[PDB]
Amino acid sequence: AAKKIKTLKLINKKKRNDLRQRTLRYEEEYESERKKIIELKREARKNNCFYREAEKKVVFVIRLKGVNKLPPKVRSVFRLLRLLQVHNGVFVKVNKATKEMLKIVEPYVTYGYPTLSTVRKLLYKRGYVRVGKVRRYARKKIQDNADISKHLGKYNVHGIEDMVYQLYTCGPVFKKVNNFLWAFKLKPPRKGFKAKRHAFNEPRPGDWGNREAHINELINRMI
Amino acid sequence: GIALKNVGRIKKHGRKHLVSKNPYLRLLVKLYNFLARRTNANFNKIIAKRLIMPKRYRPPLSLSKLQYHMANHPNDIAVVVGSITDDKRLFSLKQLKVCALRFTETARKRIEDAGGECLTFDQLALKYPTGKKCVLLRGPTKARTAEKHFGKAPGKPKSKARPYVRSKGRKFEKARGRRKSRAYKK
Amino acid sequence: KSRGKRSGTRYKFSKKFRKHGECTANKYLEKLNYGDYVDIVCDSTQQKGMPFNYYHGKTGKIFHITKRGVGVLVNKRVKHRIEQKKVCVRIEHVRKSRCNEDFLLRKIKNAELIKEAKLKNEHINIKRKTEGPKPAAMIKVPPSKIITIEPLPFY
Amino acid sequence: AKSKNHTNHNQNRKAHKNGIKKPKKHKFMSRKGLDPNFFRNQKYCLKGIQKKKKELKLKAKQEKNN
Amino acid sequence: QASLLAKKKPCKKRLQNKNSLTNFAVRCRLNPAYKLLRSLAVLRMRKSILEKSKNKKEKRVQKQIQKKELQKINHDYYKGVAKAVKKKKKREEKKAK
Amino acid sequence: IDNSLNTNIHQYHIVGRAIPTAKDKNPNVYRMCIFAKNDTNAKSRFWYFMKKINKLKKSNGELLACEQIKERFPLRVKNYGVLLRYDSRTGTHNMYKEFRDTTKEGAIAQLYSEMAGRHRARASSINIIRISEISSSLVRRPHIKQLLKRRLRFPALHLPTLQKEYRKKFASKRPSTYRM
Amino acid sequence: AVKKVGKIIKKRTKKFTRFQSNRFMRVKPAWRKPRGIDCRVRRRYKGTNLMPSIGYGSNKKTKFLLPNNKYKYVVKNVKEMEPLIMNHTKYCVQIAHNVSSKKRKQIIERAKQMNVSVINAKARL
RNA sequence: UCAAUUAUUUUUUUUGCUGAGGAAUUUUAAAAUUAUUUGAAUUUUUCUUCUUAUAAUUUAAGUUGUUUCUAUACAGUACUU
RNA sequence: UCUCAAACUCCCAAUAGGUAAAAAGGGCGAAAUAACUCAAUUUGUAUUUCACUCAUAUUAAAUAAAAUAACUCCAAGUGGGCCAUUUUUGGUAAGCAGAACUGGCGAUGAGGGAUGCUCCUAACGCUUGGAUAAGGUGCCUAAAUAUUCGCUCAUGAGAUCCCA
């Protein structure tokens, strides 16, 4: 018995060492990505030719509005989206069908590109996960990697930083991780809004729809 | 407010536990529940559920039907979650190993005479707790006469359900809509 | 009020312009199999075997073929339930369906790709993936050849 | 005495309560109405195949017993 | 008994919300690389204000040539804006009668 | 920094172009400067103009640049001429106005305030077509001509207000209006 | 409001006395659930006599517990001592309504031998 | 003087509210931190990193400690209700 | 050449609708069976038995508290409804009569709309704390006689959708 337990504990320690090594590669990659954007902009300024960077791949969508009086197509898209509660936030893979679905529920959601600090912070402070059997789930705060290393071990994620990495930039294993985590139930914004029922886009002060980068400040406001 | 399909509830159906106050069957289901939860196999769990079921889901299994099945399984032990009945259309037996919920005495005697084996479920549990090399059997579900009246409305096209007829009488329930000559036909 | 067979078909069963009279023989020669999908699209010249209003432009499986008839299983919504209904239509009204033809072409290209991928011993992903990802990109237009725009004033 | 006439109201919403049910999509279907001559030849073919299978099965079994 | 599986174990009772950011043991549990990251931050912090004060001048002086070029690039972007305003304005005066 | 007199309307230079196609083998790139309260608003106004002028909706194009544009000399007060298209309740009108301010953004905020206050025109119903620095002698507004005099030294003549701490509920004696 | 005593928390002291019982004299104060339409109880208008609710129910560790810290057991015969000795540390004796004084006194003496107080001890003296 | 605004970060001043639980082998294991010990690393270190061995401890692994008071009461005008 | 049409139509939307995205299946092959089939027993058809082999070891486009799915049985209550946005027919119009789509009320508390079954916010076990929404911040009445730029004096001014 003890030798098997010991071997497993050593394997568990090894895995944490492996996760540290993955985390280190991720850490290098984060700085490299930041520097590359800067370099791209500076090269563009020097040269006669102008340049732009790539698509940002994910979009974080926050719900804003109650569940009273919902249009039926909007109810369906909300159900698929998983923004069941009024302060639900969730990560979405940028696609055209996902964008079109997002457009249909738009007056009831704000959304944008979340940034690495926010992604890390949100998963750390407000990350809950679905623990149970398929459709017999339960809502648990994460607090240790071994639980989530179990379910996402088959798909080879095994660690919360790896989850942060995939959520921040959509990679080979996004759908499962995204689905597996419980939808983020956020607080109210700790300094409120200009006016809830008006668009961020409007000349009139408002808040719904695309908030792009600035979604992050709102997320920080309502954490 | 959180929007919830079926108010977040799993509201699946069917028997919670045995409704009978019969001590032997309550004792028996406790045993098979214990075996079902501990044992890896499906077999025990399926037996436990089938033991719980209603009377109409406890049909009799025919001795001839069991015999017909077991001839491809020639040294193996049949278990039956129902009663085994005898057959007066049946000439003789070919020697069988049967576990059943209830035995008619004539069948049991016939099985003993044949040199076969009459197993209770407790005896089966003792001998074969795994269910390895055993064979799960069950009788006809839709044989029953109530079900012979179920399905599509009498006199409605392509229907073949038996009516809940008034009486046996010749003049009754063969006219309107049941023969082309009078009004119409189904 | 009234509800006869062709009720409400004045616009719907009109001819398209420049398409008047009997249509080519070579429409009729078109080959049909059992288990084909087939669209029900009706020229208004031939009046026998004309399907009901709901089945115009609908698609379904051929389940039966006769001398100049084709049986087509079409779905119809009847209040709270969709059910399959046996619409008999003519050679005149059948059009060979095209969703299947995209699947067939897709299968053919995929099969050649599968043969190549197996031959090279390298995995492929068949998937008709997302639209939205854009790489980084360059504009090489001269810096005074770029177009300068401003809002439009009034009448 | 002065009645209201109609409305479609709530019926669609009622339909969506249990959803709109759809075909069971069976691989086999009863074939009473399908093409006489060709289908009775199919019945003869099928009976022929069954007979072919029976001949094969009976001879093989008898050979195995010997 | 041979057939019977050995007894398993249920999940533990509810434990309180030990904070991912501010509870160090939990933070290390979640992120085993964090100690090094904490060290990185501390290393930047360790370097005191005198060295920063010496350094600041050199950094700024080495940026200047680039900064002058970057100003010229932006001044040219402005030249296009100004030219567009002048051409449009002239055009309206030409247009009106 | 400030939040006591602050304007959050800023100016953005935005560049975009048509997506390359078989028809559009070489695109046309379009640039404009736009005054907005945020980048999404700036982009949406840029896109609206791309739609109004060109056939290019957000779907049909790609953004090359959006950047906030920087005040050269914020301590210097400058004469801005601004040209509008605006909508009234019963019609559309063009108008050309003069504002002396530090920067164009202050002027646009002032313009929205003026149009709202004097004409009831909301920000949505106003379109700035060009705001630019112009010579002092070319101003038509008397109130700005008055500033441009050699010697400017009026008496201040306004009420005290202090702040919340020394905003007393009651007082022993009556205040001094003149303040000298 | 809420009434803590040790780790025994009881949520509500005030009994849910019946809707407008003083208004119509015929009404009695024990709860009766309106099947009335527009009753101002079920139609849940604030400021009326509160409905009882399962939510007010006792914690499972307490459930039926007394401030005595012992579950009450009602006693009408001497013989009831024999389980009560083994349970004395968790249960308290209450002497029943009927009990004749000679028998009652004997039970009281027995309760002292069992080292458990009677919660209505002064009765019938 | 060295703004400002983003980015990744690192802290800090007062302070408000909370304490379920109850670990006959998950209050266990590792981590963390401290004092040791061995080999390395690198931005080079009086909170620098890893892993090698040893101990303790808590930031792990859901309040505990100290001092009052009730009271040196026998029902009081306090306390319960 | 001027102006045109519910019951006119060269052309012609948005919205709404249908089929499609592979394993009980599909590929390409062989052998079988017919009383169907052609001149023609492989000439096809269809079926059957044997083969070889198609992604799924992240799922032949997504997304999904997708089995809370099916299906059978037995039964209830109900069949006088009403209101709102938008499209809308009759009628001079109507808090009028009549429709369409969707959401409410009915069957519903709670906060705002000064008040108000329906408007807006939002759907509810019991409690503690937080931060907000709709909405406010002269007093009644909780928070600013806040800041900031305009405009405004009225010998019946004006002042929050529905709303007088």
PDB file of C-alpha atoms in Angstrom, chain C:
ATOM      1  CA  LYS C   1     -64.174  32.040 -45.840  1.00  0.00           C
ATOM      2  CA  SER C   2     -64.185  29.292 -48.552  1.00  0.00           C
ATOM      3  CA  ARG C   3     -61.419  26.679 -48.446  1.00  0.00           C
ATOM      4  CA  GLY C   4     -61.291  24.751 -51.774  1.00  0.00           C
ATOM      5  CA  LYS C   5     -58.183  23.075 -53.214  1.00  0.00           C
ATOM      6  CA  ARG C   6     -56.379  25.992 -54.934  1.00  0.00           C
ATOM      7  CA  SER C   7     -57.636  28.576 -52.391  1.00  0.00           C
ATOM      8  CA  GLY C   8     -55.269  31.577 -52.316  1.00  0.00           C
ATOM      9  CA  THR C   9     -52.990  30.699 -55.298  1.00  0.00           C
ATOM     10  CA  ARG C  10     -53.406  33.660 -57.765  1.00  0.00           C
ATOM     11  CA  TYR C  11     -49.899  35.026 -57.268  1.00  0.00           C
ATOM     12  CA  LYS C  12     -48.337  31.736 -56.149  1.00  0.00           C
ATOM     13  CA  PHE C  13     -49.329  29.516 -59.115  1.00  0.00           C
ATOM     14  CA  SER C  14     -48.727  32.258 -61.704  1.00  0.00           C
ATOM     15  CA  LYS C  15     -46.122  31.670 -64.430  1.00  0.00           C
ATOM     16  CA  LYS C  16     -42.799  33.507 -64.229  1.00  0.00           C
ATOM     17  CA  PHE C  17     -42.295  35.973 -67.141  1.00  0.00           C
ATOM     18  CA  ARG C  18     -40.713  34.551 -70.371  1.00  0.00           C
ATOM     19  CA  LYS C  19     -41.309  30.993 -69.080  1.00  0.00           C
ATOM     20  CA  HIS C  20     -44.812  30.504 -70.562  1.00  0.00           C
ATOM     21  CA  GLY C  21     -46.014  27.259 -72.229  1.00  0.00           C
ATOM     22  CA  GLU C  22     -44.724  23.665 -72.039  1.00  0.00           C
ATOM     23  CA  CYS C  23     -41.157  23.117 -70.830  1.00  0.00           C
ATOM     24  CA  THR C  24     -38.344  20.975 -72.343  1.00  0.00           C
ATOM     25  CA  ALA C  25     -38.519  17.184 -72.606  1.00  0.00           C
ATOM     26  CA  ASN C  26     -35.065  16.921 -71.063  1.00  0.00           C
ATOM     27  CA  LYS C  27     -36.481  18.043 -67.704  1.00  0.00           C
ATOM     28  CA  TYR C  28     -38.561  14.835 -67.693  1.00  0.00           C
ATOM     29  CA  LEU C  29     -35.652  12.575 -68.619  1.00  0.00           C
ATOM     30  CA  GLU C  30     -33.832  13.408 -65.305  1.00  0.00           C
ATOM     31  CA  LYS C  31     -33.076  10.265 -63.251  1.00  0.00           C
ATOM     32  CA  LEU C  32     -34.463   9.645 -59.766  1.00  0.00           C
ATOM     33  CA  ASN C  33     -33.632   7.003 -57.150  1.00  0.00           C
ATOM     34  CA  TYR C  34     -35.442   5.758 -54.062  1.00  0.00           C
ATOM     35  CA  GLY C  35     -33.984   7.616 -51.028  1.00  0.00           C
ATOM     36  CA  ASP C  36     -32.985  10.685 -53.058  1.00  0.00           C
ATOM     37  CA  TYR C  37     -33.894  14.045 -51.541  1.00  0.00           C
ATOM     38  CA  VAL C  38     -36.012  16.015 -53.997  1.00  0.00           C
ATOM     39  CA  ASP C  39     -37.460  19.509 -54.111  1.00  0.00           C
ATOM     40  CA  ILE C  40     -41.126  20.015 -55.076  1.00  0.00           C
ATOM     41  CA  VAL C  41     -41.187  22.997 -57.456  1.00  0.00           C
ATOM     42  CA  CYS C  42     -44.149  23.352 -59.783  1.00  0.00           C
ATOM     43  CA  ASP C  43     -44.525  24.583 -63.337  1.00  0.00           C
ATOM     44  CA  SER C  44     -48.167  25.662 -63.766  1.00  0.00           C
ATOM     45  CA  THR C  45     -48.838  24.064 -67.185  1.00  0.00           C
ATOM     46  CA  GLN C  46     -49.597  20.495 -66.178  1.00  0.00           C
ATOM     47  CA  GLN C  47     -52.534  20.414 -63.822  1.00  0.00           C
ATOM     48  CA  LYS C  48     -52.782  16.748 -62.761  1.00  0.00           C
ATOM     49  CA  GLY C  49     -50.696  15.745 -59.708  1.00  0.00           C
ATOM     50  CA  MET C  50     -50.374  19.380 -58.572  1.00  0.00           C
ATOM     51  CA  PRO C  51     -49.473  19.348 -54.820  1.00  0.00           C
ATOM     52  CA  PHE C  52     -51.052  21.533 -52.118  1.00  0.00           C
ATOM     53  CA  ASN C  53     -49.827  25.121 -51.393  1.00  0.00           C
ATOM     54  CA  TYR C  54     -47.670  24.173 -48.394  1.00  0.00           C
ATOM     55  CA  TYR C  55     -45.467  21.751 -50.335  1.00  0.00           C
ATOM     56  CA  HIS C  56     -44.305  24.281 -52.939  1.00  0.00           C
ATOM     57  CA  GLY C  57     -40.530  24.743 -52.650  1.00  0.00           C
ATOM     58  CA  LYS C  58     -40.363  22.082 -49.948  1.00  0.00           C
ATOM     59  CA  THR C  59     -37.817  19.253 -49.983  1.00  0.00           C
ATOM     60  CA  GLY C  60     -38.082  15.635 -48.871  1.00  0.00           C
ATOM     61  CA  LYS C  61     -37.050  12.064 -49.495  1.00  0.00           C
ATOM     62  CA  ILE C  62     -38.384  10.032 -52.397  1.00  0.00           C
ATOM     63  CA  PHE C  63     -39.885   6.864 -50.893  1.00  0.00           C
ATOM     64  CA  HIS C  64     -41.727   5.535 -53.936  1.00  0.00           C
ATOM     65  CA  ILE C  65     -41.599   5.990 -57.713  1.00  0.00           C
ATOM     66  CA  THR C  66     -44.384   5.065 -60.187  1.00  0.00           C
ATOM     67  CA  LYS C  67     -45.009   5.466 -63.927  1.00  0.00           C
ATOM     68  CA  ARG C  68     -44.999   9.317 -63.990  1.00  0.00           C
ATOM     69  CA  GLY C  69     -45.558   9.840 -60.239  1.00  0.00           C
ATOM     70  CA  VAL C  70     -43.065  10.203 -57.421  1.00  0.00           C
ATOM     71  CA  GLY C  71     -43.944   9.743 -53.727  1.00  0.00           C
ATOM     72  CA  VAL C  72     -42.096  12.206 -51.487  1.00  0.00           C
ATOM     73  CA  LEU C  73     -42.120  12.133 -47.677  1.00  0.00           C
ATOM     74  CA  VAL C  74     -42.504  15.792 -46.667  1.00  0.00           C
ATOM     75  CA  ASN C  75     -42.701  17.184 -43.112  1.00  0.00           C
ATOM     76  CA  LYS C  76     -45.751  19.351 -42.260  1.00  0.00           C
ATOM     77  CA  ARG C  77     -46.321  21.285 -39.032  1.00  0.00           C
ATOM     78  CA  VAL C  78     -49.800  20.480 -37.744  1.00  0.00           C
ATOM     79  CA  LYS C  79     -50.257  22.809 -34.730  1.00  0.00           C
ATOM     80  CA  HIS C  80     -48.085  21.341 -31.916  1.00  0.00           C
ATOM     81  CA  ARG C  81     -46.431  18.581 -33.977  1.00  0.00           C
ATOM     82  CA  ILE C  82     -44.423  18.087 -37.163  1.00  0.00           C
ATOM     83  CA  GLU C  83     -45.339  14.868 -39.013  1.00  0.00           C
ATOM     84  CA  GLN C  84     -44.231  13.207 -42.262  1.00  0.00           C
ATOM     85  CA  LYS C  85     -46.874  13.273 -45.001  1.00  0.00           C
ATOM     86  CA  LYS C  86     -46.840  11.328 -48.280  1.00  0.00           C
ATOM     87  CA  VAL C  87     -46.959  13.909 -51.072  1.00  0.00           C
ATOM     88  CA  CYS C  88     -47.442  12.367 -54.531  1.00  0.00           C
ATOM     89  CA  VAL C  89     -45.996  14.630 -57.226  1.00  0.00           C
ATOM     90  CA  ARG C  90     -45.211  14.421 -60.949  1.00  0.00           C
ATOM     91  CA  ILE C  91     -41.960  14.285 -62.984  1.00  0.00           C
ATOM     92  CA  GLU C  92     -42.897  17.860 -63.913  1.00  0.00           C
ATOM     93  CA  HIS C  93     -42.690  19.057 -60.270  1.00  0.00           C
ATOM     94  CA  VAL C  94     -39.632  17.168 -58.960  1.00  0.00           C
ATOM     95  CA  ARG C  95     -36.273  18.954 -58.876  1.00  0.00           C
ATOM     96  CA  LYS C  96     -33.147  17.000 -57.816  1.00  0.00           C
ATOM     97  CA  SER C  97     -32.008  18.501 -54.468  1.00  0.00           C
ATOM     98  CA  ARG C  98     -28.669  20.262 -53.925  1.00  0.00           C
ATOM     99  CA  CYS C  99     -27.798  19.966 -50.197  1.00  0.00           C
ATOM    100  CA  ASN C 100     -26.889  16.295 -50.833  1.00  0.00           C
ATOM    101  CA  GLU C 101     -24.745  17.451 -53.802  1.00  0.00           C
ATOM    102  CA  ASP C 102     -22.665  19.677 -51.484  1.00  0.00           C
ATOM    103  CA  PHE C 103     -22.247  16.682 -49.159  1.00  0.00           C
ATOM    104  CA  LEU C 104     -21.224  14.496 -52.124  1.00  0.00           C
ATOM    105  CA  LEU C 105     -18.636  16.996 -53.416  1.00  0.00           C
ATOM    106  CA  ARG C 106     -17.357  17.495 -49.847  1.00  0.00           C
ATOM    107  CA  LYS C 107     -17.028  13.724 -49.392  1.00  0.00           C
ATOM    108  CA  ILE C 108     -15.166  13.372 -52.736  1.00  0.00           C
ATOM    109  CA  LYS C 109     -12.598  16.096 -51.902  1.00  0.00           C
ATOM    110  CA  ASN C 110     -12.268  14.730 -48.346  1.00  0.00           C
ATOM    111  CA  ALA C 111     -11.725  11.184 -49.672  1.00  0.00           C
ATOM    112  CA  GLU C 112      -8.863  12.382 -51.924  1.00  0.00           C
ATOM    113  CA  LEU C 113      -7.473  14.386 -48.980  1.00  0.00           C
ATOM    114  CA  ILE C 114      -7.804  11.259 -46.736  1.00  0.00           C
ATOM    115  CA  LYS C 115      -5.910   9.210 -49.357  1.00  0.00           C
ATOM    116  CA  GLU C 116      -3.148  11.856 -49.505  1.00  0.00           C
ATOM    117  CA  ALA C 117      -3.002  12.266 -45.695  1.00  0.00           C
ATOM    118  CA  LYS C 118      -2.785   8.492 -45.160  1.00  0.00           C
ATOM    119  CA  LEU C 119      -0.130   8.269 -47.906  1.00  0.00           C
ATOM    120  CA  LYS C 120       1.916  11.010 -46.174  1.00  0.00           C
ATOM    121  CA  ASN C 121       1.120   9.673 -42.643  1.00  0.00           C
ATOM    122  CA  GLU C 122       0.034  13.092 -41.286  1.00  0.00           C
ATOM    123  CA  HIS C 123      -3.339  13.938 -39.654  1.00  0.00           C
ATOM    124  CA  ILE C 124      -5.838  16.439 -41.121  1.00  0.00           C
ATOM    125  CA  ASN C 125      -8.971  18.157 -39.795  1.00  0.00           C
ATOM    126  CA  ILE C 126     -11.988  17.893 -42.106  1.00  0.00           C
ATOM    127  CA  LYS C 127     -14.078  20.538 -40.232  1.00  0.00           C
ATOM    128  CA  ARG C 128     -15.737  23.500 -42.003  1.00  0.00           C
ATOM    129  CA  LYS C 129     -14.303  25.780 -39.269  1.00  0.00           C
ATOM    130  CA  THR C 130     -15.034  29.378 -38.124  1.00  0.00           C
ATOM    131  CA  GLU C 131     -15.041  32.724 -39.940  1.00  0.00           C
ATOM    132  CA  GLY C 132     -13.544  35.685 -38.008  1.00  0.00           C
ATOM    133  CA  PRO C 133      -9.790  35.097 -37.447  1.00  0.00           C
ATOM    134  CA  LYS C 134      -7.682  37.606 -39.413  1.00  0.00           C
ATOM    135  CA  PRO C 135      -3.827  37.691 -39.492  1.00  0.00           C
ATOM    136  CA  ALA C 136      -1.775  40.900 -39.143  1.00  0.00           C
ATOM    137  CA  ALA C 137      -1.696  42.990 -42.357  1.00  0.00           C
ATOM    138  CA  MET C 138       0.100  45.702 -44.348  1.00  0.00           C
ATOM    139  CA  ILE C 139      -0.988  48.818 -46.288  1.00  0.00           C
ATOM    140  CA  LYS C 140       1.649  49.902 -48.834  1.00  0.00           C
ATOM    141  CA  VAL C 141      -0.282  52.921 -50.231  1.00  0.00           C
ATOM    142  CA  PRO C 142       1.875  56.132 -50.561  1.00  0.00           C
ATOM    143  CA  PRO C 143       1.337  58.498 -47.605  1.00  0.00           C
ATOM    144  CA  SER C 144      -0.284  61.251 -49.692  1.00  0.00           C
ATOM    145  CA  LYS C 145      -2.162  58.789 -51.974  1.00  0.00           C
ATOM    146  CA  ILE C 146      -4.421  57.747 -49.060  1.00  0.00           C
ATOM    147  CA  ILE C 147      -8.005  59.111 -49.306  1.00  0.00           C
ATOM    148  CA  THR C 148      -8.990  61.953 -46.974  1.00  0.00           C
ATOM    149  CA  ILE C 149     -12.683  61.965 -46.052  1.00  0.00           C
ATOM    150  CA  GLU C 150     -14.988  64.315 -44.085  1.00  0.00           C
ATOM    151  CA  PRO C 151     -18.817  64.380 -43.436  1.00  0.00           C
ATOM    152  CA  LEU C 152     -21.367  65.470 -46.088  1.00  0.00           C
ATOM    153  CA  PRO C 153     -23.139  68.919 -45.786  1.00  0.00           C
ATOM    154  CA  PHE C 154     -26.797  69.758 -46.557  1.00  0.00           C
ATOM    155  CA  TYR C 155     -28.907  70.796 -49.629  1.00  0.00           C
TER     156      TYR C 155
END
